[PDB]
């Protein structure tokens, strides 16, 4: 029974495994190219999105600096440097919205 | 043209007695700039290992069974050969490091590079690796022949971070190009 001969099954296995590796070369090469398109599309959007985010950060920073000079009278310097540091902590009201 | 900047990465200065050519020289350069003594010493060093195990056998026989000494020579042969090549490599790269007399290496480096610079080719070649992976590789292998006794490592990356200002190479090539143009006029 040659359905169970070791050689033709070894042959058909080598063919299937070589064909599927060919299809895998083409697939991953195509996906790495699709990944390049997804990243360039993201990159064009990054400067308009980050610009809106920075306007929000400058606006919230300026407000908290104004709120402290009222509540605490003067501003407290957390950092010696002049660099903006995104806040780890924020003043919150004692109650959420009543809903 | 002039790259307008010749030291781009912060390097470590080591006190040494000779000029530093390359803190991370490529594998091929170490083999090419090897003196013929380096092949003499590294071949003598590789033979020392199995010859030591032979002499111990003659004076003080181990009393091992029929095939053991032949097995042990194969290990002593490899270990000697492995340490012989590491010794052969260290002799050539210490000259690149300025930790051994290197006048000959300094002059062949100042010619090979000024030949690449007048040809427009990159000084240290082109990497297939990314410029950050090139840096991780420079950082991993610079001065790494000084740890050869413990962990070995070789530079197989064509990076551009070798610890030396490249201005001298561009200066000589342009002066060599300056002399070439004047000589070509009288024709």
């Amino acid at each position: 029974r040659g359905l169970f001969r070791p050689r033709p099954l070894l042959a058909g296995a080598a063919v299937l495994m070589l064909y599927g590796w060919y299809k895998l070369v083409k697939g991953i090469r195509e996906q790495n190219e699709l990944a390049r398109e997804k990243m360039w599309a993201r990159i064009h959007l990054i400067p308009l999105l980050q610009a809106e985010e920075d306007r929000d950060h400058v606006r919230r920073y300026l407000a908290d600096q104004a709120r402290e000079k009222g509540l605490l009278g003067e501003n407290i310097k957390v950092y010696n440097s002049d660099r903006y540091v995104r806040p780890t902590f924020a003043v919150t009201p004692s109650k959420p919205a009543q809903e | 043209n002039t790259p307008t900047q010749t030291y781009q990465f912060p390097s470590k200065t080591v006190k040494t007695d000779y000029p530093l050519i390359d803190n991370d020289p490529h594998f091929t350069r170490v083999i090419r700039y090897a003196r013929p003594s380096d092949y003499a010493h590294g071949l003598a060093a590789a033979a020392a290992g199995p010859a030591a195990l032979w002499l111990m056998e003659r004076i003080s026989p181990s009393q091992v069974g029929r095939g053991g000494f032949a097995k042990a020579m194969r290990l002593a042969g490899f270990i000697g050969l492995a340490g012989g090549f590491l010794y052969f490599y260290q002799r050539s790269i210490l000259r690149f490091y300025g930790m051994s007399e290197n006048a000959r290496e300094v002059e062949m480096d100042m010619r090979e590079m000024t030949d690449r610079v007048k040809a427009g080719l990159p000084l240290y070649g082109e990497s297939r690796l990314s410029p950050a992976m090139q840096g991780v590789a420079a950082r991993q292998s610079r001065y790494s022949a000084l740890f050869f006794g413990v962990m070995p490592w070789f530079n197989f990356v064509n990076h551009n971070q070798h610890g030396v200002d490249t201005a001298k190479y561009y200066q000589q090539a342009e002066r060599e190009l300056e002399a070439e143009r004047l000589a070509r006029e009288q024709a």
């Binding site: 993201r42 809106e52 306007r55 924020a90 919150t92 | -």
Partner: protein, 85 residues
């Protein structure tokens, strides 16, 4: 011959997989405003869905208006937590 009564439990197993795939798809399509749901989402996609709620009120809502509606610059959510920093 073919023992079709042997293949009946296998047909039920296949069918209940079909029940699962069809129902998960329908419920998610409703939850996502009669739109196909999103999968394999990263920080950018989650930030983009939260920007969509800012303009439309629904995380999956889409508007093409070149100008933002008034109050968009004050509606940027800053997440408030108690312990996981």
């Amino acid at each position: 011959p073919v023992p079709f009564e042997t293949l009946i439990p296998y047909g039920i197993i296949i069918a209940m997989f079909g029940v699962t795939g069809a129902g998960m798809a329908k419920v998610r399509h409703m939850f996502n405003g009669d739109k196909r749901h999103r999968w394999s989402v990263d920080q950018w996609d989650k930030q983009q869905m939260e920007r969509d709620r800012r303009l439309t009120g629904h995380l999956r809502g889409q508007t093409d208006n070149p100008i933002a509606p008034p109050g968009f610059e004050f509606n940027n959510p800053w997440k408030v937590x108690x312990x996981x920093x």
